[PDB]
From a paper:
Purified [name]-bound [name] was mixed with mini-Gs heterotrimer and Nb35 to form a complex that was isolated from the unbound G protein by size exclusion chromatography and vitrified for single-particle cryo-EM analysis. The reconstruction of the [name]-Gs complex had a nominal resolution of 2.9 Å. The receptor portion of the complex was flexible and therefore focussed refinement was used to improve its resolution from 3.5 Å to 3.2 Å. In [name], the agonist [name] is found in a cavity formed by transmembrane helices TM3, TM5, TM6 and TM7, and is separated from the outside of the cell by extracellular loop (ECL) 2, which is held in position across the OBS by the Class A canonical disulphide bond between Cys205ECL2 and Cys1203.25. All the receptor-ligand contacts (≤ 3.9 Å) in [name] are mediated by eight amino acid residue side chains, four of which are aromatic (Tyr1323.37, Trp2866.48, Tyr2896.51, Tyr3167.43), two hydrophobic (Val3127.39, Val3157.42) and two polar (Asp1273.32, Asn2175.42). All of the interactions are mediated by van der Waals interactions with the exception of a strong polar interaction between the charges on Asp1273.32 and the tertiary amine in [name]. The OBS of [name] overlaps the positions of the OBS in 5-HT4R and β2AR and the position of the agonists also overlap, but the pocket itself is smaller and lacks the extracellular access seen in the aminergic receptors. In addition, [name] contains hallmarks of activation in the conserved regions essential for stabilisation of the active state, including the P5.50-I3.40-F6.44 motif, the C3.36-W6.48-x-F6.44 motif, the D3.49-R3.50-Y3.51 motif, and the N7.49P7.50xxY7.53 motif. The position of Trp2866.48 in [name] is rotated by 35° around the TM6 helical axis compared to its position in β2AR, resulting in a 4.2 Å difference in its position (measured at the CH2 atom).
Approximately half of the ~800 human GPCRs are chemosensory receptors. These belong to the rhodopsin-like class A family and can be divided into two groups, the odorant receptors (ORs) and the trace amine-associated receptors (TAARs). The TAARs are a small family of specialised receptors with only 6 representatives encoded by the human genome, compared to about 400 OR genes. The amino acid sequence of the TAAR studied here, [name], is most similar to aminergic receptors, specifically the β2-adrenoceptor (β2AR), rather than to ORs. In order to define the molecular recognition determinants of odorants by TAAR receptors, we determined a structure of murine [name] ([name]) by electron cryo-microscopy (cryo-EM) in an active state coupled to the heterotrimeric G protein, Gs. [name] was chosen from a screen of multiple different olfactory receptors as being a highly expressed receptor in insect cells using the baculovirus expression system and also being relatively stable after detergent solubilisation as assessed by fluorescence-detection size exclusion chromatography (FSEC).
Numbering used by the authors:
A (entry chain G): 8 to 62
B (entry chain B): 6 to 340
C (entry chain A): 12 to 61, 206 to 253, 264 to 394
D (entry chain R): 49 to 184, 203 to 250, 261 to 337
E (entry chain N): 1 to 126
Amino acid sequence: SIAQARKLVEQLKMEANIDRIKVSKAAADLMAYCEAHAKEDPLLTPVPASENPFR
Amino acid sequence: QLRQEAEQLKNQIRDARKACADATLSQITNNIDPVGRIQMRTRRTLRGHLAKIYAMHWGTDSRLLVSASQDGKLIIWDSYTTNKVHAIPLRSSWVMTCAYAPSGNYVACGGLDNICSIYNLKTREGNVRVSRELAGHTGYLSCCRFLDDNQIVTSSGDTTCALWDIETGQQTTTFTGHTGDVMSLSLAPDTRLFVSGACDASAKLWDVREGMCRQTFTGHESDINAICFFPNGNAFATGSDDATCRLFDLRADQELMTYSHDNIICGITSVSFSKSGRLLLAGYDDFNCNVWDALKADRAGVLAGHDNRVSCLGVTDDGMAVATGSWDSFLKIWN
Amino acid sequence: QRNEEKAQREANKKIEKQLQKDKQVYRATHRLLLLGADNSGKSTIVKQMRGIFETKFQVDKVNFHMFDVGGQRDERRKWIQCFNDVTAIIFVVDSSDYNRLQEALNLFKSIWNNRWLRTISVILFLNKQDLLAEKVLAGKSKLEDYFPEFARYTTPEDATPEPGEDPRVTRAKYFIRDEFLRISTASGDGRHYCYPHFTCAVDTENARRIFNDCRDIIQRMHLRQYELL
Amino acid sequence: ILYAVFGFGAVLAVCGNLLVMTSILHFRQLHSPANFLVASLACADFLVGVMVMPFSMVRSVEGCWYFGDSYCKLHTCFDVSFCYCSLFHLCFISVDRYIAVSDPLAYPTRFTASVSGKCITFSWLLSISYGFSLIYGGCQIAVNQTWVFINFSVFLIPTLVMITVYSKIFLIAKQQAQNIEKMSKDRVAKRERKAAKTLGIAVAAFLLSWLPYFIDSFIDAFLGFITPTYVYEILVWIVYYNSAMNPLIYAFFYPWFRKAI
Amino acid sequence: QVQLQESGGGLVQPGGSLRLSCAASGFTFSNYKMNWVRQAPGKGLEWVSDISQSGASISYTGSVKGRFTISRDNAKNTLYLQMNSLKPEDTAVYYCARCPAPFTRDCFDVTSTTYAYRGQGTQVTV
Ligand SMILES: CC(C)CCC[C@@H](C)[C@H]1CC[C@H]2[C@@H]3CC=C4C[C@@H](OC(=O)CCC(=O)O)CC[C@]4(C)[C@H]3CC[C@]12C
Ligand SMILES: CN(C)C1CCCCC1
């Protein structure tokens, strides 16, 4: 299993050179997207029965 | 001796992850108002499957949906009028997944039979027949999803995902890396990346072109069953047998928030987001689904409507509906 | 718009006709999951009775489809959940192995207490009894070395040994059967039951056995629902 | 003062039967061939408590029929058709359980929804035909020393069919119950007690209600001791209580029907 | 992540004693039934013992019954196997294993060739 371990270590090392951002930035981005697109979410905002096609 | 540098490099990666973690998605989100008390009721109840449903998939027009049942049936429903459109009889009755093509022309399904069958819906004659059967996997297919009409991504029980060119029939790419059965598959909105969750409690991101995993995500304690990108595609959510859901962001490469309760002790079977990504919907093994506020991690609602195990759950592209299929052979539409 | 709705309703009617026509067929047949090790003679039994190996056998105007799962990998934790609705699990054991027997017991125990596989009856076949009798007469390998508790086991008064069978062979046979039945009755809750059988590789009366066990299973299901048992 | 118990009986015949009709017709997981017979029996039992039972509620205690000849004719025809339709239905349900327990593999093929429909239609038409062909101040059905024999004989046919099959099921239940303990004797007796309880209550629910009214009729016609009228009405009421007995015995007693609601 | 690390073992003369330890990390140790399995040289994976969540029900394979003792300490999240009276058919690589899912009393795939919840194991030779 020397080949398997070698390839596993090589792949895991290849995944270390990734440009990471702060977790706070990611949280802010997700919150911003949710806030921006909330106005058009039929589940979030109770759809009126007039144009709801499951009347 | 190789495991020594493997272990120390994993330690270095974990240290980097800890360093990159300054604030959690609990204090940043606590400032906004709570989502509320979402109550939904079954607009439509689709009846017709004989056995338990495993999977289903909406159309891109948010009208039609295919559903797969163990009696060997792939049934297409018109959601608004509850009418059926097609009822395809399967060669193998152990179908564990189905996909409806984004163009609406094709349907796929596979399972224990080891082959992914692709069907065309718009023949000149009119009837629906076997467009092509893709073989090559050595384990049950847990999920399949379409990039386009001529290129499909599949994930099998032999610890492998496969990207197929449908015209030639050969697996253009073979994604390998997982240790356990790959159980779920979710594709990015750009259809360039896709995450896959397996039984080794790991979710791996793959670039479709590169053919090698870009990032790996751990944090669960048991087998992963369901996975789904956040609508923008910079995050995804996974459900497991831990009775916990977790949200992972790609760029942060770290778990953000876990959704779990002391009361809940059964595993998650299916996970889907809303259109806005504010509501995360998870189907559990205790015969009902729970609606979490994906940001505040609260429990916002409950879709207690099913008599048996909730198998599959999905949300329309329009965001107008939620389909839930369960092990009592009944599809339900919620709004 | 009326034309489209009328055509859609016609299509739904033509589909529901086909589902009504197929529901009878689906309810008629009984599905059976065939589990067993490589050593165990499930291949020979299915061959004599006749990816996924599906076989169909018809007895007394009743059709059973036995589904031997062979194409998958060693792990079975996920693919097994597909068989919550099968009438029975036919679990085959090579009883003359003495070394891969605890493997069989462990598998049977895992099946018994599975949340999804509960409420499913197990028809338990103990194949290769000829070889077990030959081994016990030979005496080269001692069973106690593998199962200490067999040193004090006593053949029960309810046993029905075959004519011309040495007491040693009967004692070993029923020891193995009791090993399985302890696990079976440890936690049953009356929802499902184990049906053990003693079969050989030259036994041709198996299909009727499965028919009898399936009839008993369905009878018990009906009796419990009418609260008569 | 006796109107209390009759009113309580009427309430059950009416309050509780609705959530059986609507349950079977609405809840799609109960559209089985077996439950069609139960629904038919439930609707017969309700229509007994809707047509004839209310019109005999205050008329009985009053002692005079203050409605008219046509009213009496309808009230009697409905009564002799409805009560006998309930009888044949109980017989059909019974045979359904017999076919379910004995010969359980071929149960779906033998007893389909079509056969359930044939049995229901047969029961209805037979009951209505018998009522019409028999029947067509106060009212009192003439005895004439001949009528009773008919009335009883038609009662005598399905009950013996429906006594014997319930006994045969008990021996099937007896045979199985032994197999659990022997494979695994107060232990077997524990289950025998519950099996006997369920079959005995099912049998008594009809056998203790119709039979007193037929033995009273016999002793009246034959032995010569004329029964005072009021006793006749108490016998009539005990025969009408079966209509309220059926919803409790056949629907409520089963946990699965409980979990349906 | 789920990490099981075995410790103990080595070269001991027949009739000696050993103590095999398993440190668990990355999961709620208290909630899974834990197993010991062994890989004999040139043989398949063999289940050796298991202990339930609270240790109420412990089970051993018939061969080793009477001389091995399984235990678990949930305070420090550790699993122990006490080995007494070794004999030269006991030499093997010993693997600690965790049961696939919590709140269950069945454990499937624990002896699988590429299970995902077993440690690297320790060599115990005599
Ligand atoms: C004709 C002779 C032999 C019997 C006459 C009495 C029966 C009509 C009674 C006796 C016991 C009763 C049952 C006792 C308890 C219940 C549970 C009850 O449901 C409940 O939740 C109440 C509490 C409980 O479960 O005990 C519904 C009615 C039912 C089935 C009763 C239905 C009517 C029964 C069968
Ligand atoms: C007066 N009722 C209760 C009877 C009349 C005769 C038929 C059976 C019903």
